[PDB]
Enzyme design. Structure first.
Site, PDB file in Angstrom:
ATOM      1  N   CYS A   1      33.382   3.411 -17.101  1.00 38.85           N
ATOM      2  CA  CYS A   1      34.326   2.277 -17.529  1.00 38.85           C
ATOM      3  C   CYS A   1      34.599   2.183 -19.157  1.00 38.85           C
ATOM      4  CB  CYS A   1      33.760   1.041 -17.075  1.00 38.85           C
ATOM      5  SG  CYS A   1      34.933  -0.275 -17.430  1.00 38.85           S
TER       6      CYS A   1
ATOM      7  N   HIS B   1      20.905   0.781 -19.891  1.00 37.27           N
ATOM      8  CA  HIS B   1      20.535   0.704 -21.344  1.00 37.27           C
ATOM      9  C   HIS B   1      18.924  -0.022 -21.687  1.00 37.27           C
ATOM     10  CE1 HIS B   1      24.355   1.673 -23.026  1.00 37.27           C
ATOM     11  NE2 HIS B   1      24.889   1.307 -21.790  1.00 37.27           N
TER      12      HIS B   1
ATOM     13  N   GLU C   1      21.260   8.351 -27.282  1.00 40.51           N
ATOM     14  CA  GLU C   1      21.818   8.269 -26.013  1.00 40.51           C
ATOM     15  C   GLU C   1      21.185   9.206 -25.029  1.00 40.51           C
ATOM     16  OE1 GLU C   1      25.871   9.572 -26.883  1.00 40.51           O
ATOM     17  OE2 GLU C   1      25.783   8.167 -28.821  1.00 40.51           O
TER      18      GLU C   1
ATOM     19  N   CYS D   1      27.970   4.751 -30.180  1.00 43.14           N
ATOM     20  CA  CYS D   1      28.019   4.760 -28.625  1.00 43.14           C
ATOM     21  C   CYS D   1      28.639   3.472 -28.052  1.00 43.14           C
ATOM     22  CB  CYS D   1      26.513   4.894 -28.075  1.00 43.14           C
ATOM     23  SG  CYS D   1      26.232   4.799 -26.311  1.00 43.14           S
TER      24      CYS D   1
ATOM     25  N   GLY E   1      26.431   1.362 -25.581  1.00 45.75           N
ATOM     26  CA  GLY E   1      25.277   0.740 -26.217  1.00 45.75           C
ATOM     27  C   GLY E   1      25.489  -0.233 -26.784  1.00 45.75           C
TER      28      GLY E   1
END
Lengths: 274, 150
Positions: free
Chosen positions: A73, A159, A208, A217, A220
């Protein structure tokens, strides 16, 4: 074949108009173009396509440097949205697009930033996946002798977010690899090192999954704000400073999608005779 | 005309107030396309002819914004009727970009397509029968600048 080189905060793309061009790819050709010394050089290839639903404006597809499709996404969404405008494929600032696994509306703002709907943060450990007794705002992880306090969330990828005093002194290079492949993350995790400046502003570094630390990122950044918010640390609009630049995250809590607004840059136009 | 074996044809992309285009179904089938008719013994002539005859619209209710200066497609091997002479192997086409000036309740499907519908601008490029795909690419590409102006 015409293409454009673009990047969002250093995440760089070869972008191809497959609307007005007849373009073909194979995994091997993609691996050959991604190679930075022998090819064009990019992390991901973005292929822009006619829509397959009469009410959307485009479809787009992304391949990684190994030649396989990526279904994540908001991945490439800001480069996609400025591209279709810059190359005259559309005039709209609200652009409706399908992707490998979804459908979304991109808003290109007046300052050339793109606002992306990243979906709703998922805190349930089984969806991350994350080995735990149940969902909690804060978790204790054992990292050799070190004790780590973190939050865990899924943005569609996993995460682990750790609040730090100073991102500059955070042990990204030493603790990132430990946590990234920890036993409690069966599919690994992106490891964020979040320094809270104010309720509206964090500094962030991310080790990552698979790739270690880069300049930026995007998911993140979303996970860090989502964790920071539900630990009561952050306001519902947060400015995120990464090594490569600034993102802004807006989330109103469970029951609402999280939004990410950031930049995208056009570097050059290329022609290659496949 | 009628050639090399190509047959002269006109095609109509009917644009919109909002930048949409008219997508029509072909009678008794689930295939969709832009209107396209023959050229009797001018380009503009047959377009208005195929326009009024197959869509039910006159010079009144539309306005032409652009045209192409001959686009060919060959038919697929198996669809060529070699026992009909002269042998036709495909089409040469001049395309017109139109703008509906009056209203949807004026699109009269007959006369003599079937069903029609508004559709986002680039949708038809991937939706039409394979062998017309490349002609659709170039016409939609060419007209893209003109349509956005609205």
């Amino acid at each position: 074949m015409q293409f454009s080189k673009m990047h969002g905060l250093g995440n760089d793309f070869m972008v191809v108009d497959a609307v007005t061009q007849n373009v073909f790819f194979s995994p091997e050709l993609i691996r050959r173009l991604a190679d930075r010394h022998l090819g064009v050089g990019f992390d991901q290839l973005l292929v822009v396509e006619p829509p397959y639903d009469p009410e959307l404006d485009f479809h787009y597809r992304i391949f990684n440097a190994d030649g396989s499709e990526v279904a994540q996404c908001g991945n490439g969404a800001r480069c996609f949205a400025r591209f279709v405008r810059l190359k005259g494929l559309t005039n709209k600032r609200d652009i409706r697009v399908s992707t490998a696994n979804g459908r979304m509306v991109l808003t290109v703002t007046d300052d050339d930033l793109v606002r992306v709907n990243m979906g709703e943060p998922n805190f349930e450990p089984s969806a991350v996946p994350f080995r735990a007794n149940k969902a909690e705002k804060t978790y204790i992880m054992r990292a050799a002798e070190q004790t780590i306090l973190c939050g865990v969330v899924s943005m569609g990828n996993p995460h682990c977010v750790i609040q730090v005093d100073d991102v500059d002194t955070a042990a990204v290079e030493t603790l990132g690899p430990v946590l990234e492949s920890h036993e409690r993350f069966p599919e690994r995790a992106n490891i964020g090192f979040m320094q809270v400046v104010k309720r509206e502003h964090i500094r962030l570094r991310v080790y990552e999954r698979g790739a270690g630390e880069t300049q930026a990122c995007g998911s993140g950044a979303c996970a860090a704000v989502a964790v920071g918010i539900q630990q009561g640390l952050l306001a519902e609009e947060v400015r995120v400073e990464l090594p490569g630049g600034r993102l802004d995250i807006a989330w109103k809590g469970p029951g609402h999608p999280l939004y990410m607004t950031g930049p995208a840059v056009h570097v050059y136009d290329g022609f290659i005779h496949l | 005309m009628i050639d090399d074996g190509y047959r002269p044809n006109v095609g109509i992309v009917i644009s919109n107030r909002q930048g949409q285009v008219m997508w029509a179904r072909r009678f008794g089938q689930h295939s969709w396309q832009f209107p396209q008719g023959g050229i009797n013994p001018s380009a503009e002539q047959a377009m208005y002819r195929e326009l009024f005859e197959e869509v039910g619209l006159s010079r009144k209710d539309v306005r032409i914004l652009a045209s192409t200066r001959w686009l060919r497609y060959k038919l697929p091997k198996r669809l060529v009727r070699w026992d009909t002479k002269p042998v036709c192997i495909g089409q040469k086409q001049k395309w017109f970009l139109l703008q509906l000036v009056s209203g949807d309740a004026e699109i009269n499907m007959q006369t003599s397509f079937d069903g029609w519908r508004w559709v986002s601008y680039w949708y038809p490029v991937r939706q039409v029968v394979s062998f017309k795909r490349d002609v659709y690419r170039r016409v939609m590409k060419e007209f893209a600048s003109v349509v956005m102006s609205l």
